[PDB]
Amino acid sequence: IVEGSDAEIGMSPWQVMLFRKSPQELLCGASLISDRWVLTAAHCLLYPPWDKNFTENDLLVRIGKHSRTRYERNIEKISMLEKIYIHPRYNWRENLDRDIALMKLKKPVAFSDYIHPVCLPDRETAASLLQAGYKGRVTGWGNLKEGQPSVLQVVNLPIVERPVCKDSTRIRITDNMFCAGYKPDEGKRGDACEGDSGGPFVMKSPFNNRWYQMGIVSWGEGCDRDGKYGFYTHVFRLKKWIQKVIDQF
């Protein structure tokens, strides 16, 4: 995360780290959506132009974490994967359309002060909250600039109107994406970056005071560049698929 700050303890208890077994290293961010399901970006798992195709046995999820590198004894929980589910129309060939995947845990994780699931939006909350100017929050242990942080980082960012999103890039943008970030002249700045992939963009509903995950960190050209914006998978748009997968697995 660029130009964010250190997270508070327990501030993002749904934050998950995708972790490589060998060599042991951070791979991506992710989120806890129930005691046995984790949500992440498909490109965290499958990206053939980079010869990336991870399978369950390559990976672990670490839940309840604050520090990036430390093993947080008596606090984090580490979980093995039962099954990875990738959107079948995930478009890695062109623009990362439908950049979303689910991971089912071998065994359920125990909730705690540091481990708790995020809500997924209903159509009304989404319609309510996904407006230009409305700020969400993104969290991650990724790059601090275009080194790496000691603890989880947090940054709040405004949703950007779709024509400005579209006009900032040569990529073909879809309804399954949204973009977020300050405009060059808006003064403030901040962005997700390499390593933040698959982590959540969340919003706090003013109607019932719960946190909802509206987005997944997906792509961007550079990090925190003027006139460029971070792009996020639109979780509500793909909820149908989400519900199917969980409903039948």
Partner: peptide, 27 residues
């Protein structure tokens, strides 16, 4: 069910240091 309510914040009625920035944007 219990989703989205953080044990160290919402469940204790404590606010984190920047969540009001988000609230203030929801005009």
């Amino acid at each position: 069910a219990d989703c989205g309510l953080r044990p160290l914040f919402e469940k204790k009625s404590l606010e984190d240091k920047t969540e009001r920035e988000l609230l203030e944007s929801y005009i």
